Design a protein around this ligand. Structure first.
Ligand SMILES: CN(C)c1ccc2c(-c3cc(C(=O)NCCOCCOCCCCCNS(C)(=O)=O)ccc3C(=O)O)c3ccc(=[N+](C)C)cc-3oc2c1
Length: 293
């Protein structure tokens, strides 16, 4: 079955006075492949993808500040905080050119970094990514009242911070197949202490939905503008019914984005890596062999 283990040796780097944890496997030479997770996951979400790529390419998978095994400073964990730390992480490792593999809030980080540094990105593989959502009618109906509630400082903090609903409920509701107890405990581990759950609540409050928050809407529209023009090689994975990306949106993008291959993973919601890791990893490995890296 789908692997539940996390076999990777820990690596740490000090970034803006904080320790960040990252996976680092594969050959030392060549262009590295940088894997960026989102909310409410960690490098754990890549555990079954990376072994398809690590035979032939360096694989780097950081834990975002405040998540996974990375340090947990007392921040608001706005997107801007994550931008600052990830910019600094990339420079701290001395990375030059990279290929991005990104998901969920990792995709906003990766696309925003790529748009600002396009000479350094040799391809982007992405799935269930952050786009401006025009209206709440575009959010899945089965999750709509809850995500509206999440975006409040009263009910939303009760649910996410006090009661850990984003880990105990929203996360499994983002995977078609059932998560095992071992997998749930891996996703629970960074957040056993409620005071450490700020990123879990700030992230859905940063989602650009119906024009709010206006600043994130503008930032995400900017990198989407770039994505519609840039020749950067693109690999888009999508599933049915999806969450952030419905199938009809993936089909539009597969035609409108230049140099874009789109891959149907079958049933999927948000954590597509948990529903079809074999296809995602094997398609990434094949696609990499076609890039000038
Ligand atoms: C401890 N106590 C107070 C609760 C409270 C509520 C629940 C709930 C629950 C979830 C929800 C709920 O989370 N609805 C929302 C689902 O949305 C799914 C689609 O988006 C996946 C996105 C993934 C992350 C994207 N990240 S990003 C870009 O946003 O940063 C609503 C009501 C309930 C309910 O039951 O009352 C559980 C639901 C399922 C479950 N099982 C399958 C084991 C366990 C649940 O346990 C719960 C425990």
């Amino acid at each position: 079955g789908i692997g539940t283990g996390f076999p990777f040796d820990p690596h740490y780097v000090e970034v803006l006075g904080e320790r960040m944890h990252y996976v680092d496997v594969g050959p030392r030479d060549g262009t590295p492949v940088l894997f960026l997770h989102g909310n409410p996951t960690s490098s754990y979400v890549w555990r079954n993808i990376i072994p398809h790529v690590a035979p032939t390419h360096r694989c780097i998978a950081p834990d975002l500040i405040g998540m996974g095994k990375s340090d947990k400073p007392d921040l608001g964990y706005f997107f801007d905080d994550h931008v600052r730390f990830m910019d600094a992480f990339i420079e701290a490792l001395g990375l030059e050119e990279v290929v991005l593999v990104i998901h969920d809030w990792g995709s906003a980080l990766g696309f925003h970094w790529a748009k600002r540094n396009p000479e350094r990105v040799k391809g982007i593989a992405f799935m269930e990514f952050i786009r401006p959502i025009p209206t709440w009618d575009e959010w899945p109906e089965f999750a709509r009242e809850t995500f509206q509630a999440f975006r409040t400082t009263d009910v939303g903090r009760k649910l996410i911070i006090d009661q850990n609903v984003f880990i105990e409920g929203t996360l499994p509701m983002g995977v078609v197949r059932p998560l095992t107890e071992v997998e749930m405990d891996h996703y629970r581990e960074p957040f056993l202490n409620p005071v450490d759950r700020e990123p879990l609540w700030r992230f859905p409050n940063e989602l650009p939905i119906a024009g709010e928050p206006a600043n994130i809407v503008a930032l995400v529209e900017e990198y989407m503008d770039w994505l519609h023009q840039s020749p950067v090689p693109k690999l888009l994975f999508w599933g049915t019914p999806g969450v952030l990306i419905p199938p009809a949106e993936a089909a539009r993008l597969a035609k409108s984005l230049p140099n874009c291959k789109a891959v149907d993973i079958g049933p999927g919601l948000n954590l597509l890596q948990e529903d079809n890791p074999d296809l995602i990893g094997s398609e990434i490995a094949r696609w990499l062999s076609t890039l000038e890296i």
